[PDB]
From Swiss-Prot:
Expression across tissues: Expressed at varying levels in several tissues, whereas a smaller transcript was expressed specifically in testis.
Taxonomic path: Eukaryota, Metazoa, Chordata, Craniata, Vertebrata
Parts of the chain that traverse the membrane: none
First and last residues shown, out of full length: 2054 to 2166 of 2168
Similarity remark: Belongs to the WAL family.
Function: Regulatory subunit of the ATP-dependent BRF-1 and BRF-5 ISWI chromatin remodeling complexes, which form ordered nucleosome arrays on chromatin and facilitate access to DNA during DNA-templated processes such as DNA replication, transcription, and repair. Both complexes regulate the spacing of nucleosomes along the chromatin and have the ability to slide mononucleosomes to the center of a DNA template. The BRF-1 ISWI chromatin remodeling complex has a lower ATP hydrolysis rate than the BRF-5 ISWI chromatin remodeling complex.
Subunit structure: Component of the BRF-1 ISWI chromatin remodeling complex, at least composed of SMARCA1 and BAZ2B, which regulates the spacing of histone octamers on the DNA template to facilitate access to DNA. Within the BRF-1 ISWI chromatin remodeling complex interacts with SMARCA1; the interaction is direct. Component of the BRF-5 ISWI chromatin remodeling complex, at least composed of SMARCA5/SNF2H and BAZ2B, which regulates the spacing of histone octamers on the DNA template to facilitate access to DNA.
Places the protein is found: Nucleus
Protein name: Bromodomain adjacent to zinc finger domain protein 2B
UniProt domain Bromo: residue ranges: 9-113
Source organism superkingdom: Eukaryota
């Protein structure tokens, strides 16, 4: 509350650490479905169904241009990529499996880096 704060955590490396996580996600062999925005002209249904499209290149652009106010907002976008994936793709499909793989891969890097 006013003049009553938990000890100040060092957040000075967060931008650099998120960047590294995101690079590792970009270079994973199963990243291919998430590297670029889904083409809303070429994929029927996607624009109407998926209210907040997200992908790694968009995350990268936001990260590099100071559009994430904090760690949590970066993690929410990353998770959105996989939530979107699950909404649109069957679990038993190459893309559905990629999504589950990448979320697991992500959450581990996340826990190891920040928890």
């Amino acid at each position: 509350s006013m003049s009553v704060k938990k000890p100040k955590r060092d957040d000075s490396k967060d931008l650099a650490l998120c960047s590294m996580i995101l690079t590792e996600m970009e270079t994973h062999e199963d990243a291919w479905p998430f590297l670029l925005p889904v083409n809303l002209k070429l994929v029927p249904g996607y624009k109407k169904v998926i209210k907040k499209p997200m992908d790694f290149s968009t995350i990268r652009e936001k990260l590099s241009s100071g559009q994430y106010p904090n760690l949590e907002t970066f993690a929410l976008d990353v998770r959105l990529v996989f939530d979107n994936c699950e909404t649109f793709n069957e679990d038993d499909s190459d893309i559905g499996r990629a999504g589950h793989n990448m979320r697991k891969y992500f959450e581990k890097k996340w826990t190891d880096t920040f928890k």
